[PDB]
Amino acid sequence: GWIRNIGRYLSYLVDDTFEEYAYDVVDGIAKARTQEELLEGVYKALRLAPKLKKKAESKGCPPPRIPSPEDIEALEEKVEQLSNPKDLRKLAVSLALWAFASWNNCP
Amino acid sequence: SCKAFQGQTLREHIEAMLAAWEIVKNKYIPSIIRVMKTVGVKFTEEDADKFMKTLIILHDVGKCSEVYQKHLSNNEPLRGFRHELVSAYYAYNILKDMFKDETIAFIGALVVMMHHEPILMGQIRSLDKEELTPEVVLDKLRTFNGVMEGTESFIKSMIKEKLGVIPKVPSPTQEDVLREVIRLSVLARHRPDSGKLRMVVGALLIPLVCDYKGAKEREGESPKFAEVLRVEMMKAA
Amino acid sequence: ELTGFEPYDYQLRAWEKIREIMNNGGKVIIEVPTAGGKTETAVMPFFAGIYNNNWPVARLVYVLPTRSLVEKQAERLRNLVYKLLQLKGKSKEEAEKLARELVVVEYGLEKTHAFLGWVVVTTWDAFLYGLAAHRTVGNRFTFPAGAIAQSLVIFDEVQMYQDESMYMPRLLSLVVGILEEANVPLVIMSATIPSKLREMIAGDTEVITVDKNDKNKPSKGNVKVRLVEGDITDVLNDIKKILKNGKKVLVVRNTVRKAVETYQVLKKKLNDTLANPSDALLIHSRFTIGDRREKERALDSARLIVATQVVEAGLDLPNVGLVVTDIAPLDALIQRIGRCARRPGEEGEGIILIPENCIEHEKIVRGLSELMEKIGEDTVVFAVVTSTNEYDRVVEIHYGEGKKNFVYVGDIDTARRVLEKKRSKKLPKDLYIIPYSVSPYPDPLVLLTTYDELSKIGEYLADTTKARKALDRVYKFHYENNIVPKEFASYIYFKELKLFSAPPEYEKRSRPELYVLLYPMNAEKWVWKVRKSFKIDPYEIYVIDAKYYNSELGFITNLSDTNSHTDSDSKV
Amino acid sequence: FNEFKTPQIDPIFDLYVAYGYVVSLIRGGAKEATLIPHGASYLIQTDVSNEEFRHGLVDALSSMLSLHIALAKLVSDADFSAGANINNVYWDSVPRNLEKLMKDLEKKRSVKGTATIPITLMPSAGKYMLKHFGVQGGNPIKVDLLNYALAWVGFHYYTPYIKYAKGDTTWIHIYQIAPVEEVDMISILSLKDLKMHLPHYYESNLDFLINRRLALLYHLLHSEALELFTEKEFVIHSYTLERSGNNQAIRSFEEEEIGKLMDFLWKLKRRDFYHAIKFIDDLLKKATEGALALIDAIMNERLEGFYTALKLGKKAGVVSSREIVAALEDIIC
DNA sequence: TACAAGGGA
DNA sequence: TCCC
Ligand code: NI
Numbered sequence A: 001g002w003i004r005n006i007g008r009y010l011s012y013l014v015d016d017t018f019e020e021y022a023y024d025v026v027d028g029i030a031k032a033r034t035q036e037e038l039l040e041g042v043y044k045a046l047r048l049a050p051k052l053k054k055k056a057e058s059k060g061c062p063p064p065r066i067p068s069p070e071d072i073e074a075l076e077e078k079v080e081q082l083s084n085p086k087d088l089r090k091l092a093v094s095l096a097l098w099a100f101a102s103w104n105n106c107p
Numbered sequence B: 001s002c003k004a005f006q007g008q009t010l011r012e013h014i015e016a017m018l019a020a021w022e023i024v025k026n027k028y029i030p031s032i033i034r035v036m037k038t039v040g041v042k043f044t045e046e047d048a049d050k051f052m053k054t055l056i057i058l059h060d061v062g063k064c065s066e067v068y069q070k071h072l073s074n075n076e077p078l079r080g081f082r083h084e085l086v087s088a089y090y091a092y093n094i095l096k097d098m099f100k101d102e103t104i105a106f107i108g109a110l111v112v113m114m115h116h117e118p119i120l121m122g123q124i125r126s127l128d129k130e131e132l133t134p135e136v137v138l139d140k141l142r143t144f145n146g147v148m149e150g151t152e153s154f155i156k157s158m159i160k161e162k163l164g165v166i167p168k169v170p171s172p173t174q175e176d177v178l179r180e181v182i183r184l185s186v187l188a189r190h191r192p193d194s195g196k197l198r199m200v201v202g203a204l205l206i207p208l209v210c211d212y213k214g215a216k217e218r219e220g221e222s223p224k225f226a227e228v229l230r231v232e233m234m235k236a237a
Numbered sequence C: 001e002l003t004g005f006e007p008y009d010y011q012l013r014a015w016e017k018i019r020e021i022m023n024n025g026g027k028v029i030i031e032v033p034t035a036g037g038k039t040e041t042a043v044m045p046f047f048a049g050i051y052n053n054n055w056p057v058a059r060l061v062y063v064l065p066t067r068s069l070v071e072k073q074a075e076r077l078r079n080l081v082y083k084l085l086q087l088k089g090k091s092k093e094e095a096e097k098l099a100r101e102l103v104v105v106e107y108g109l110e111k112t113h114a115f116l117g118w119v120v121v122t123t124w125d126a127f128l129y130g131l132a133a134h135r136t137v138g139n140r141f142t143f144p145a146g147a148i149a150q151s152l153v154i155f156d157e158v159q160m161y162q163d164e165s166m167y168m169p170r171l172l173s174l175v176v177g178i179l180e181e182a183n184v185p186l187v188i189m190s191a192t193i194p195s196k197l198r199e200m201i202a203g204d205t206e207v208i209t210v211d212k213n214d215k216n217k218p219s220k221g222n223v224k225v226r227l228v229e230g231d232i233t234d235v236l237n238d239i240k241k242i243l244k245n246g247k248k249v250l251v252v253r254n255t256v257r258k259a260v261e262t263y264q265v266l267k268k269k270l271n272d273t274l275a276n277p278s279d280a281l282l283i284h285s286r287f288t289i290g291d292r293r294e295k296e297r298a299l300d301s302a303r304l305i306v307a308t309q310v311v312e313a314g315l316d317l318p319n320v321g322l323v324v325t326d327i328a329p330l331d332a333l334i335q336r337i338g339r340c341a342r343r344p345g346e347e348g349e350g351i352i353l354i355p356e357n358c359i360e361h362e363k364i365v366r367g368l369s370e371l372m373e374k375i376g377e378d379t380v381v382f383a384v385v386t387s388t389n390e391y392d393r394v395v396e397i398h399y400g401e402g403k404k405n406f407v408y409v410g411d412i413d414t415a416r417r418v419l420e421k422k423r424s425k426k427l428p429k430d431l432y433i434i435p436y437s438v439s440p441y442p443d444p445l446v447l448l449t450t451y452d453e454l455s456k457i458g459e460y461l462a463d464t465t466k467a468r469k470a471l472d473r474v475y476k477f478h479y480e481n482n483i484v485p486k487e488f489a490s491y492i493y494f495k496e497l498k499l500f501s502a503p504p505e506y507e508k509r510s511r512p513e514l515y516v517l518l519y520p521m522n523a524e525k526w527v528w529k530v531r532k533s534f535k536i537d538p539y540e541i542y543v544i545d546a547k548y549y550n551s552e553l554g555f556i557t558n559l560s561d562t563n564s565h566t567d568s569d570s571k572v
Numbered sequence D: 001f002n003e004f005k006t007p008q009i010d011p012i013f014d015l016y017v018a019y020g021y022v023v024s025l026i027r028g029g030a031k032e033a034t035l036i037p038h039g040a041s042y043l044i045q046t047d048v049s050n051e052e053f054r055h056g057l058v059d060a061l062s063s064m065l066s067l068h069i070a071l072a073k074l075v076s077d078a079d080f081s082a083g084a085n086i087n088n089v090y091w092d093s094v095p096r097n098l099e100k101l102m103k104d105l106e107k108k109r110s111v112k113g114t115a116t117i118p119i120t121l122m123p124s125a126g127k128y129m130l131k132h133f134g135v136q137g138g139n140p141i142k143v144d145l146l147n148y149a150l151a152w153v154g155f156h157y158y159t160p161y162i163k164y165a166k167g168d169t170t171w172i173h174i175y176q177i178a179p180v181e182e183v184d185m186i187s188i189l190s191l192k193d194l195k196m197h198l199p200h201y202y203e204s205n206l207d208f209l210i211n212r213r214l215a216l217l218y219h220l221l222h223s224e225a226l227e228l229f230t231e232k233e234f235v236i237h238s239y240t241l242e243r244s245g246n247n248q249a250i251r252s253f254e255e256e257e258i259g260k261l262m263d264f265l266w267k268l269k270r271r272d273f274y275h276a277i278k279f280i281d282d283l284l285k286k287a288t289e290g291a292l293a294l295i296d297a298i299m300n301e302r303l304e305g306f307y308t309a310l311k312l313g314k315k316a317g318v319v320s321s322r323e324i325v326a327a328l329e330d331i332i333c
Numbered sequence E: 001t002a003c004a005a006g007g008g009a
Numbered sequence F: 001t002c003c004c
């Protein structure tokens, strides 16, 4: 549920085809204790969209797909109720592990 | 009332198998007999004809599993359904009932198991991307629900037409066929027999080459396969 | 009928031994010296089995141990089946059409069918591959060893020493043992074998050997053997004196490198007779552009026949004159020189040409195979040859069973119900590698253009290739040493190159430069002091004749190779 | 029912003898048999008499000696000859004991002596023993010849073991699989399928056979006998043997289980194998630290272990396909 | 991973 | 003491 798309977008920052290697954002978002730092980390991760799209357009492969706003609000509306950090940890690590999948983008 | 193949019904295919086996009988039966003395139990060529006829009738009963056949009718994928397992359950139980012997039904269950293609377990080097793997076999095994309701009826019908002695049908739920197939496969994999099993059961596999005759095929080497379809002519001309 | 003999050979000495096979039997042993020429071992029982249908046995299998004239055996079986087709019909035209089709070489390709054919010729190299392989077409699996069980499998001198890769008597003992409980008749043909093997592979089978009564066996005649110096110039005087007479010279090399140069250095210094219709016709050794029959059926001529360790078995040359050969491990030599078939005599001559020991580095591995090779002066053309090999290979090697890369364990646990060889666990079975002969000068543009995977796009079945003619296009390459690749590597259905990190055996391979029609290429005090020497290898690649202490072989070619780093101290 | 009693010596050696009982039984027949564990006794119930038991045992040891003679005072590179015998003198001692047991056995004669048990079949034994204020000369611990030989057969036919050379020294990891509740014939033959002969791995690139847990993970990667213990409880007892400067000793005796590791592997490999076996092999060979993190995560169910393993794999050479990520997420639940 | 320290016939 |  709305995890595959954000997983692909995050993997766009790790694939060798994108010679930028933004590991700080994924490392920070993986190690999150509560709401504020994870929100800041995901914001920093999604802030790098223009450079990814420009690099993809200049390389010739199809541009990356930014997560749709329809499921953008899903992250928020599910995350406020996660007062306990424990059940937050499973999703915080699920996004990180989905960020490291193959996700063949530019053939 | 059921259909085995996508292009052919149950009868128009199984009758072709049985009819071809009548010609190939005098060619391949004595090899089966010389193999089956080694097992420790032996009967005449006529009882061998009965055993082969039972294998011919019972290797496609599992095809009519009311879910796999639905996938066959359409183009839906089957993702590794081994109906030969349920067919081996049927063959084992029914041959318990008729032939009153324990090892020959085990051999026949294995013969049904290889039908189309045998299972592959252990000793692999990651060259089994397809369904040749016990995990997907167990997947299909637990996802197995049940056979057609008329399966017992037409099984009795073909039992009457081929032998006519007594009609009897085994009923697999899900766990019972699990126990039967796991027991038979594990025992065949490991016994004091080392090379005896492969020779014997491959020998019983060899006559089961009429599937190319049953359905139309476009293989280039099939004509070469037709070289050994008929034996040397007994009559000079 | 069984009494009627279709060939013009009348009745042989082993006519009464035919009934020992029957339909329910075990191991039956047949022995006769120089069986390569006049074999007639087990084809008559099968032929008499099929005269009025009522087949006792499904098929027949003839086994060539390592590398020999498979095409010659195929032609012989084709001629025999055509002859038995006589007196029954089939006119003249369509008999040969089916005779050519029922014979299958089965090199290993054409996965559509595993093993089919009324009579086929196989090789132990391919026989091992046949016991475990997957041939699935149309969701139908043809089990390659299924036909082996009920067919008559017959060996032919399968105790022949090779390039440290086939001479394993323990493997043969294991094979005969595992075949014993299958309740199938197994008969083996051999010229010379030790007495020690004849008891651990046949514990209750009597040897028929040669019987003084009913003297009808094909005698060899008079053969004289002498030790001569190995030089190219020395043998010349023995050539011009046989070619004019009408005889021929048969040169045998123990190394492919020596064979790929002997013909070239001998075809230019003679300049006496024709070359196109007579020369350029030799035995196949991973060359001739895949196929072998193109220069195999034309060998029936009294001309120069350059050869190597491939002509050792499977030859019925009627005119045998002088045979020169390199160092041989006695058992190889006696089989090679026993080529004088037909009528006894014919002034059969066989000699050995070795400079000192240089030919022992590829077919002897030093050891007793080369140390006792020079102690071979008797003709050994009788049935008492068994009293000769005991002190040549049994007293020094077979007692210590010193062998390298022996994979016996891969045939017991692996071969229980079913497995496959191309995907082993830890011990790959070194049998053969099939290369592809190309010569694209401007064509290479990555992916080798053609010969694609042909996936779901284009082909619905996604399993189709243009290798229909490739069945007679691959070589016979054995994995011995590669060091670095020289040809275009392959992974699946050619192309994709890559695989620069120790490419494995089997399949793949595509030879570009090595593709041509002509050829394809890239004890003094020790004996009198003690006995019971060691085996295996050490820092020096040769054996050790350990009399009391140390005493390695600072001799042969290993010392010359090792002298590149230490040439002092009299080469140790 | 025979209900043959099994001597109480060591729940490791007792396991070996009472668990080679079944392999001696199967070759002679003895259907409808079961093995009831008693913590350490491991009693067996069977409908067999003694003669068929003896025929099965002699058949097993005849195959054993046939395998022994295939390589060569004869020393063979076998599990019971040199693969597991850490001591050089045992390389010759064990085959002689086996052939003496045979020679006594085919002539319907019971044994009359006792023999010293190596540390291989029981790590609890050794050379000395503290009596009150010191040790005894020689080896105080000794066992009956028939029990010794049959435990050797059981060890050779069932229990996997892995050797790695690394020059002069040598690591030998020995594992024994133990039930605690109930087993039948089919289960025991499934366990038998796990045993693989001649695991002389040596080599230099395969250097991760140290860290015994990693070695057993690698061995279980290529083992596909059955997923039997997902319905039956089983444990694993492991130990290591070392040749550090010709100084042989046991330096590891941790006792965790085996069920959940292969359960996670089996739930991990539904999607495909072409990207599963190579995935594990690449993570083991390249990211040894990542493989250690992954195995710790499997052992103790911690979320960060999977992430660390995936990051270490991706950093060097691992593709980390999508389906394996989905399988890992499904394992997380 | 460098050093030592050991188990037996 | 021999035996790595
Ligand atoms: Ni079917």
Ligand code: NI
Residues within 6 Å of the ligand: B116, B211, B212, C139, C140
């Ligand atoms: Ni079919």
